[PDB]
């Protein structure tokens, strides 16, 4: 119901895709989320169809929102399909898996050039002041270009790996392991934590996808921090580089750098590489 919408009524024919257009092989699975599957589909342009199972103005609301989002390190929705989710199709899928798969062998350019993907994508997320919750490295994919997608967001958000989230007096499934301090002590998220999680994401990336902190249990790793611990500086990256997981990682969430900032002083160690 258009009466049910703000002033965004014109918007809903611009993010509504006709059952017509879209053809979805349900007997392709590219995805197991605990909201639902995610399938192979044609809209011809292949494309990723996400399933919703295991209010309709506030999830068009939500759409339009996430359509009106463009930039090429950040995935985009196609449309919603009256519902499906009609999202770009990832060749290389998810960045985690990407990086553990001996098929590829990215160089620590190419690690780094992930990482500054990454940066330009949340970047552009918090100039819109949008606050993702869930950066982590199996939450970014990849395209037949290698172009790396920020993505587990607004009608694609969900737990696509569930062994990394852990249940919380508030009942919460947490990325505890990806969490900045103050977020574990009070459950609110802001830009600075996701700055938290980026510092995490780079040490996925120079690690090729090692789980971080994996003799610690959990809730625990609060009292692992504050112990006075950081994750350790993996063999293949760059001092610098190193220098800028801590920033990321400053016990004052506003002494972090900004996305802006993190962009800046990628793009640099970067460009000290060859090959
Ligand atoms: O080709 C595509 C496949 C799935 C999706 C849905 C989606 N949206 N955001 C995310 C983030 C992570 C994952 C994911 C998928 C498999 C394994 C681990 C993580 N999926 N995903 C979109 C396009």
């Not at 919408?5 to 092989?25: K, R």
């Not at 950040?74 to 290389?92: A, D, E, N, T």
């Not at 098929?103 to 350019?109: F, I, M, R, Y």
């Amino acid at each position: 119901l258009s009466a049910l919408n703000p002033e965004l009524v014109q918007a809903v024919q611009h993010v509504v895709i006709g059952p017509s257009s879209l053809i979805v092989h349900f007997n392709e699975v590219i995805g197991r989320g605990h909201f639902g599957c995610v399938y192979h589909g044609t809209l011809k342009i292949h494309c990723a169809v996400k399933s919703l199972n295991r209010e309709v103005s506030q999830f068009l609301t939500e759409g339009i929102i996430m359509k009106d989002f463009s930039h090429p390190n950040v995935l985009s929705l196609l449309g919603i399909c009256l519902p499906l989710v009609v999202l770009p199709y990832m060749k290389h899928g998810d960045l985690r898996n990407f990086i553990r798969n001996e098929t590829h062998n990215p160089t620590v350019k190419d690690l780094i050039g992930f990482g500054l993907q990454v940066a330009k994508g949340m970047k552009y997320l918090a100039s819109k002041k949008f606050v993702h919750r869930d950066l982590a490295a199996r939450n970014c994919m990849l395209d037949e270009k290698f172009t790396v997608k920020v993505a587990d967001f607004g009608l694609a958000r969900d737990m696509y790996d569930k062994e990394y989230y852990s249940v919380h007096k508030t009942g919460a499934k947490l990325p505890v392991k990806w969490m900045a301090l103050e977020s574990l002590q009070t459950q609110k998220f802001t830009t600075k934590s996701d700055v938290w999680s980026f510092g995490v994401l780079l040490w996925e990336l120079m690690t090729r996808g090692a789980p971080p902190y994996p003799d610690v249990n959990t809730f625990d790793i609060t009292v692992y921090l504050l112990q006075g611990r950081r994750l350790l500086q993996p063999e293949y990256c760059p001092d610098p580089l190193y220098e800028v997981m801590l920033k990321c990682w400053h016990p004052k969430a506003e002494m972090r750098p900004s996305f802006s900032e993190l962009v800046s002083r990628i793009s640099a160690i970067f460009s000290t590489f060859i090959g």
